[PDB]
Amino acid sequence: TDTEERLVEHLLDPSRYNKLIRPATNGSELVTVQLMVSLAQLISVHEREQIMTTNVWLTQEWEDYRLT
Amino acid sequence: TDTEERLVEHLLDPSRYNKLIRPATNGSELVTVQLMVSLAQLISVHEREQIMTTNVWLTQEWEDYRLTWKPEEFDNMKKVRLPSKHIWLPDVVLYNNADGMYEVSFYSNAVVSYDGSIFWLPPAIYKSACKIEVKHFPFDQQNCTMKFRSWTYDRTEIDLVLKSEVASLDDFTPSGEWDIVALPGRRNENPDDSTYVDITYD
Amino acid sequence: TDTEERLVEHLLDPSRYNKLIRPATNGSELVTVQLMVSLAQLISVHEREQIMTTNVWLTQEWEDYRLTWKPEEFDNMKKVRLPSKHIWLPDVVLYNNADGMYEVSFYSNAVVSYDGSIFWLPPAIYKSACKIEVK
Amino acid sequence: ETRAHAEERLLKKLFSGYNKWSRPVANISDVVLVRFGLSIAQLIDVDEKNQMMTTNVWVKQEWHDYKLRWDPADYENVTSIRIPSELIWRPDI
Amino acid sequence: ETRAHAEERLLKKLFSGYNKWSRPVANISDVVLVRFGLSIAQLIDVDEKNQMMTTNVWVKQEWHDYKLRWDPADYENVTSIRIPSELIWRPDIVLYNNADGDFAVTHLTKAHLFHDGRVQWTPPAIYKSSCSIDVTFFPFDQQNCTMKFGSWTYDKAKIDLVNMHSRVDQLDFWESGEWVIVDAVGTYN
Numbered sequence: 123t124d125t126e127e128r129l130v131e132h133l134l135d136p137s138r139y140n141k142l143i144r145p146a147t148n149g150s151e152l153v154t155v156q157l158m159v160s161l162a163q164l165i166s167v168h169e170r171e172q173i174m175t176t177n178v179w180l181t182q183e184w185e186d187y188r189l190t
Numbered sequence: 191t192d193t194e195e196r197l198v199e200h201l202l203d204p205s206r207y208n209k210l211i212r213p214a215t216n217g218s219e220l221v222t223v224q225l226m227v228s229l230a231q232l233i234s235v236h237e238r239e240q241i242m243t244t245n246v247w248l249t250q251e252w253e254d255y256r257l258t259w260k261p262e263e264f265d266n267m268k269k270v271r272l273p274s275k276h277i278w279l280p281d282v283v284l285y286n287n288a289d290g291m292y293e294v295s296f297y298s299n300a301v302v303s304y305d306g307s308i309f310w311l312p313p314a315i316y317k318s319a320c321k322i323e324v325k326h327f328p329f330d331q332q333n334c335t336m337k338f339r340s341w342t343y344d345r346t347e348i349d350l351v352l353k354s355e356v357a358s359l360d361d362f363t364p365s366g367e368w369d370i371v372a373l374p375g376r377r378n379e380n381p382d383d384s385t386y387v388d389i390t391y392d
Numbered sequence: 393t394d395t396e397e398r399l400v401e402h403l404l405d406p407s408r409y410n411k412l413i414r415p416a417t418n419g420s421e422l423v424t425v426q427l428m429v430s431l432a433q434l435i436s437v438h439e440r441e442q443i444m445t446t447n448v449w450l451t452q453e454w455e456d457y458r459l460t461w462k463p464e465e466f467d468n469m470k471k472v473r474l475p476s477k478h479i480w481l482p483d484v485v486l487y488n489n490a491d492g493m494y495e496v497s498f499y500s501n502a503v504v505s506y507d508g509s510i511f512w513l514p515p516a517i518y519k520s521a522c523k524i525e526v527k
Numbered sequence: 528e529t530r531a532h533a534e535e536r537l538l539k540k541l542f543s544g545y546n547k548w549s550r551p552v553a554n555i556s557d558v559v560l561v562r563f564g565l566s567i568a569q570l571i572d573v574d575e576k577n578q579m580m581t582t583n584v585w586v587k588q589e590w591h592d593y594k595l596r597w598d599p600a601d602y603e604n605v606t607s608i609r610i611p612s613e614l615i616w617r618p619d620i
Numbered sequence: 621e622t623r624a625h626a627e628e629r630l631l632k633k634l635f636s637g638y639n640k641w642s643r644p645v646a647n648i649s650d651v652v653l654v655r656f657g658l659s660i661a662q663l664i665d666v667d668e669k670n671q672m673m674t675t676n677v678w679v680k681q682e683w684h685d686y687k688l689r690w691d692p693a694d695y696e697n698v699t700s701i702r703i704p705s706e707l708i709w710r711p712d713i714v715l716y717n718n719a720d721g722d723f724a725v726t727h728l729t730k731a732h733l734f735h736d737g738r739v740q741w742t743p744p745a746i747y748k749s750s751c752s753i754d755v756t757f758f759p760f761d762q763q764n765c766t767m768k769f770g771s772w773t774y775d776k777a778k779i780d781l782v783n784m785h786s787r788v789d790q791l792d793f794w795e796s797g798e799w800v801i802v803d804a805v806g807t808y809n
């Protein structure tokens with residue numbers, strides 16, 4: 123939609139949103155990231171090479187005050 | 191943080207910082223680069239092909255006088271991360287590699303201090319050729335070397351120096367098939383070249 | 393030379409030449425592309441995998457009316473080399489390839505004549521799938 | 528007048544204010560119907576020991592973009608064009 | 621006054637109107653003389669079964685660009701600079717008899733540019749070339765594997781190659797322990 127395109131252009135505008143900078147309001151503030159691993163499939167275990175191959179969906183949740 | 195965005199925009203402003211120019215002024219002085227290899231893991235030593243695969247961090251430190259700021263003017267900010275691809279880097283690579291992979295693997299961010307000190311710690315996966323001594327196999331001890339040079343600048347432009355005399359094992363995971371004995375580092379010049387310098391780890 | 397670089401800037405000027413648009417002229421016409429494969433070496437035939445590996449030079453020729461110039465205005469230059477990545481190419485690929493590599497390997501220059509003739513001869517290492525008869 | 532010039536004008540018009548990150552629907556409640564199909568080029572391998580199938584397929588997709596419409600009468604009867612797929616919104620199948 | 625400012629001024633002046641897609645000759649009839657040489661870092665693998673040789677070489681190239689010239693007196697006595705090789709014109713030297721590798725150089729290191737227009741570009745390259753393998757006297761066999769280098773789209777009237785040195789440079793060679801290089805000479809054809 124026109125509104126969605128307008129919002130996406132507003133949010134990602136490189137003029138006002140720098141994607142290389144941590145979204146911390148204060149210098150000493152820290153960003154909390156929530157992690158959860160979903161094991162979709164254990165593809166293999168290689169005893170000789172000592173490697174486990176898995177298919178996992180890695181949930182990651184945090185807050186970005188600049189994307190409001 | 192708005193202050194960090196302002197500082198990052200100020201430091202890398204193209205009108206005042208060009209990454210194609212080596213940070214050496216008042217004549218062609220030397221940019222001293224401190225090297226320190228930290229061995230994360232000894233992946234393998236394929237004896238048949240004579241290739242040792244290692245996972246290391248190529249710690250590098252130098253001084254860029256163009257990346258300084260006053261902490262008082264930036265909310266007392268004394269360090270900032272800058273993308274390594276946007277600042278001048280000493281193109282230190284693995285010269286004695288096999289498979290022709292010279293550069294680091296990721297090109298991570300560099301940590302800049304307010305006095306112009308750059309601290310870069312990129313990860314690298316290196317497949318270095320080494321000479322296999324088969325005389326005492328299977329009770330054999332191997333001496334595989336990794337030679338580091340800059341494939342851009344010679345000794346007259348950058349000086350390679352050793353941060354410490356041994357490679358660091360602060361974040362090492364034992365291999366299970368090979369046992370680390372010693373990881374000394376040495377800085378090698380050439381008495382009859384004056385433009386050659388390399389740092390080799392045994 | 394100054395004239396050569398002037399010509400190159402004039403031809404590839406994005407404001408007048410778009411490389412995403414087919415050089416079709418006279419209406420809803422079609423661009424005729426001439427192919428010629430030159431076998432430089434039969435690197436290998438892998439019977440167990442049923443893959444043939446060849447080193448070939450793939451001659452591709454077509455006419456782009458947008459890359460025309462008058463030799464008089466450009467110091468009587470009759471042809472120039474243009475980077476093939478900056479002109480319209482017919483996306484000619486090897487369909488029956490194995491290993492999922494469709495395009496040519498190098499992307500050399502394309503030799504462009506003053507009348508719009510384009511001569512492209514890139515080298516390629518191709519791995520094609522073929523049916524091995526074991527009888 | 529030439530088809531190439533009309534196509535250049537059309538390309539300028541279509542992507543003037545186009546956003547490739549926004550779902551291409553005129554109304555938020557609308558659903559993008561993606562006609563999906565597979566055309567198998569070859570069954571490269573069936574690795575029984577590792578329990579994997581390697582296939583070479585063509586992933587046929589087809590949707591509608593409401594901001595990529597035009598009248599061919601205004602562009603020398605240009606009815607369709609080939610554009611890089613990285614310039615437009617695509618489903619993330 | 622400082623060298624960095626002079627270098628910035630020089631870099632701005634050089635690339636003001638520089639076209640990297642144009643052969644760098646003042647006169648169209650002029651030939652770009654490219655001095656070509658090889659330096660073998662190591663002989664990674666000789667594959668008798670597949671008839672391929674893998675080498676780690678440094679492709680030493682040197683030519684003249686008439687637009688990348690300056691007077692060092694006007695730039696704080698700056699006599700040379702290192703510039704990315706993707707900013708300038710380079711010859712398209714490729715390995716004809718490639719097999720399972722890359723035809724052209726892909727590393728694209730920085731080029732050493734001198735005040736008189738000379739450009740030295742010495743990128744590394746891993747090449748996997750084809751060579752016929754003669755195993756009549758195996759394991760006492762001696763192989764003769766060749767590498768053919770030349771520009772792909774510029775004829776002799778536009779780019780000409782010059783042997784920097786007869787013999788392939790072996791000063792930085794990594795001895796393999798399986799093969800010894802009896803002879804390694806480049807021949808102009």
Ligand SMILES: *[C@@H]1O[C@H](CO)[C@@H](O[C@@H]2O[C@H](CO)[C@@H](O[C@@H]3O[C@H](CO)[C@@H](O)[C@H](O)[C@@H]3O)[C@H](O)[C@H]2NC(C)=O)[C@H](O)[C@H]1NC(C)=O
Binds near residue numbers: 333
């Ligand atoms: C592992 O391999 C390296 C490289 O082959 C060996 O390095 C070499 O070691 C010898 C003996 O220590 C060095 O010779 C000595 O150099 C010193 C320093 O100038 C000199 O004072 C002595 O008179 C003698 O010439 C040699 O320079 C050195 N070469 C390199 C390139 O480092 C190393 O010894 C081997 N280590 C083990 C445990 O096998």
Ligand SMILES: *[C@@H]1O[C@H](CO)[C@@H](O)[C@H](O)[C@H]1NC(C)=O
Binds near residue numbers: 554555556
């Ligand atoms: C979008 O669709 C909903 C559901 O039919 C409708 O209520 C709404 O008015 C539509 N919006 C517009 C702008 O037509």
Ligand SMILES: *[C@@H]1O[C@H](CO)[C@@H](O)[C@H](O)[C@H]1NC(C)=O
Binds near residue numbers: 420604606
């Ligand atoms: C437009 O082109 C189509 C073919 O794509 C053709 O069938 C139709 O008759 C043409 N119409 C006009 C007005 O040229």
Ligand SMILES: *[C@@H]1O[C@H](CO)[C@@H](O)[C@H](O)[C@H]1NC(C)=O
Binds near residue numbers: 647648649
């Ligand atoms: C280029 O060289 C040719 C051959 O000597 C000469 O005839 C011609 O005048 C030269 N062009 C210029 C502009 O000097």
Ligand SMILES: *[C@@H]1O[C@H](CO)[C@@H](O)[C@H](O)[C@H]1NC(C)=O
Binds near residue numbers: 697699
């Ligand atoms: C310029 O630098 C060169 C070394 O690159 C030196 O030999 C020469 O004396 C210098 N000239 C001046 C005027 O400083």
Ligand SMILES: *[C@@H]1O[C@H](CO)[C@@H](O)[C@H](O)[C@H]1NC(C)=O
Binds near residue numbers: 764766
């Ligand atoms: C090696 O091959 C080259 C070209 O094929 C030939 O000129 C040369 O004489 C050969 N040398 C030997 C020792 O066979």
Ligand SMILES: CC(=O)OCC[N+](C)(C)C
Binds near residue numbers: 500503512771773
């Ligand atoms: C013009 C052109 O691209 O020629 C390529 C083939 N070669 C190197 C034999 C001339």
Ligand SMILES: [Ca+2]
Binds near residue numbers: 572573575
């Ligand atoms: Ca199988």
Ligand SMILES: [Ca+2]
Binds near residue numbers: 665666667668
């Ligand atoms: Ca071998």
